[PDB]
Amino acid sequence: ADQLTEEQIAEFKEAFSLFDKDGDGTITTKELGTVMRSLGQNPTEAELQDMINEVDADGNGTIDFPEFLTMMARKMKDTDSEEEIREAFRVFDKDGNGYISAAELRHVMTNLGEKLTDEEVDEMIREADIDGDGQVNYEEFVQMMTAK
Structure with missing residues (x-):
């Protein structure tokens, strides 16, 4: 149902690689709003800083693709498009x-x-x-x- 389809996972993967210049499969928090904007999403800076405060629990100021899939699922779950x-x-x-x-x-x-x-x-x-x-x-x- 509201489960991420294999395609939705790929769409986010292409947008996630556009900013993965470390070949580490990860991106920085500074490029988080940029990747979301690539998908046509425009969260305010506070909305971004709020999720960062929770994800920035490792203190690595970075985000990996799995955790990125957890961000889109928080938006598109009980409220699918x-x-x-x-x-x-x-x-x-x-x-x-x-x-x-x-x-x-x-x-x-x-x-x-x-x-x-x-x-x-x-x-x-x-x-x-x-x-x-x-x-x-x-x-x-x-x-x-x-x-x-």
Whole structure:
């Protein structure tokens, strides 16, 4: 469910290596807000200094990838991002039936303000047999926008 998918673990791994110039698989605290900003997250300085005070328990002023996975899990656990897209698709379920027209679905994804490109959705529409019927549920399209 709210468990980190193998992809989400890789996405954070690429952003974590961008600042791993020590080939030690670790990064400094000064580059913590920079890695989070790479994923599009903007925590305030106090929010960062608060987690650092707890992680800076070793006194190494550094962070390794496993502990980094514990930081994203604290943000995205009981409040996965999936609850944000599903609640939006809800705004689009005017019939409380759990189904909307592919248009209202592609629209749910664009009005949200996601950095989605019309080409990426066209790929998500190919495996989401959006034909054969005429209307499609979003639970399948929600997991796709998060991470295949």
